[model samples]
Target: MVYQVKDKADLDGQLTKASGKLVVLDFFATWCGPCKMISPKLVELSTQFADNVVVLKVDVDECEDIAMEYNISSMPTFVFLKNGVKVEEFAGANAKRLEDVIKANI
Candidate 1:
């Protein structure tokens, strides 16, 4: 499933939902061109891996604190988590690598 975190509280709620599952956070901002470019693919990723993973998108402008917490330094970052703990991170929009990571982790 794919979820959009509205704020820190919403992000916290989803963290609980991530327990024992693969959770991916896509951090981005409204003005980021690359972020917009990869949005649809990320959604496709969520649907394709629905059985084993959960994808969460966080708008940096709307959820600044949570974005900061993740130490987001770029437009689009894929932060991977296992059982609510951050395990790996991939910066930028690499569709193949994203799938590879998900496959390897799952």
Candidate 2:
């Protein structure tokens, strides 16, 4: 399932709470075209890896602090976390790359 993190606290909670499980965080905004394009693929990942990964979404517009904290200068920036630490990061709509990282990290 896609967890919509509304605030910094929520994001931190999810990040910390996901320890021992791979966490996929998609930092995006509503006005971004690329963000919209990759959203479904993110959903697919969330569904397919439900048992192995925790999918999280952070709206940069709403959570600017969190975005800044992660240095998300581009839309659809994906951050992968394992054991409450970031293990990988990527930008844009590369579905294959996203899935590949998920498979590799998880």
Candidate 3:
């Protein structure tokens, strides 16, 4: 399932829980059109790769500190993490690229 991160603490806790699994941190804002467009695909990916990946959605407006920490400049910035460390990241709503990155990591 795609988990919703409430704040920095929630994000930290989820990352810790996901530990060795690949974590996809989706940084997005409700006002972003592209973010809306890619939301369903992200959820589908979360389920498709349920065994190896964990998807975490962080609303930029709600989690300002986390957003700033990640240096998120765009609405749909995807940050990949493994073992609690960031490994790769990209900005945009490109679903195919997102799946490609996830496949590469897993």
Model 1 segments more than 4 A misplaced: none
- Candidate 2 per-residue lDDT, tens place, 15-43, comes to 77776999998999999999999899989
Q: Which candidate model has the greater lDDT, 1 or 2?
A: 2
lDDT of 1: 0.85
The pairs that clash in candidate 1 are none
Q: How close to the true structure is residue 95 of candidate 1, measured as C-alpha lDDT?
A: 82
Greater TM-score among 2 and 3 belongs to 3
Best candidate (score: lDDT): 3
RMSD in Å for all candidates: 1.2, 0.9, 0.8
Overall lDDT per candidate, in order of appearance: 0.85, 0.90, 0.92
Q: What does candidate 3's lDDT look like per residue over 1-106, in tens digits?
A: 9998988889889988897999999999899999999999998989999989999999988889998888989879999999967889999999999999999998
- How close is every model to the real structure, measured as TM-score? 0.92, 0.95, 0.96
In Å, residue 48's CA in model 1 sits off its true spot by 0.8
> Model 1, poorest ten-residue lDDT window?
12-21
Q: TM-score of model 2 relative to the true fold?
A: 0.95
